[PDB]
Coordinates of C-alpha atoms in Angstrom, one line a residue:
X378 CA 0.0 0.0 0.0
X379 CA 2.4 2.7 1.3
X380 CA 6.2 2.9 0.9
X381 CA 7.1 5.9 2.8
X382 CA 4.2 6.1 5.1
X383 CA 5.1 2.3 5.6
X384 CA 8.3 3.4 7.1
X385 CA 6.2 6.0 9.0
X386 CA 3.5 3.7 10.2
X387 CA 6.3 1.3 11.2
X388 CA 7.4 4.3 13.3
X389 CA 3.6 4.5 14.5
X390 CA 3.9 0.8 15.4
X391 CA 7.0 1.4 17.4
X392 CA 5.2 4.3 19.2
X393 CA 4.8 7.1 16.7
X394 CA 5.4 10.5 18.7
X395 CA 5.2 8.2 21.7
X396 CA 8.1 6.3 20.4
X397 CA 11.7 7.0 20.8
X398 CA 12.0 8.0 17.2
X399 CA 11.0 11.1 15.1
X400 CA 8.7 10.5 12.1
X401 CA 10.5 8.9 9.2
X402 CA 8.1 10.1 6.4

């Protein structure tokens, strides 16, 4: 479906803004 949101949502899965990472997409 997505390619960069995919990397993003993957970020969402880790935590999103609640994760230790900044948003990738």
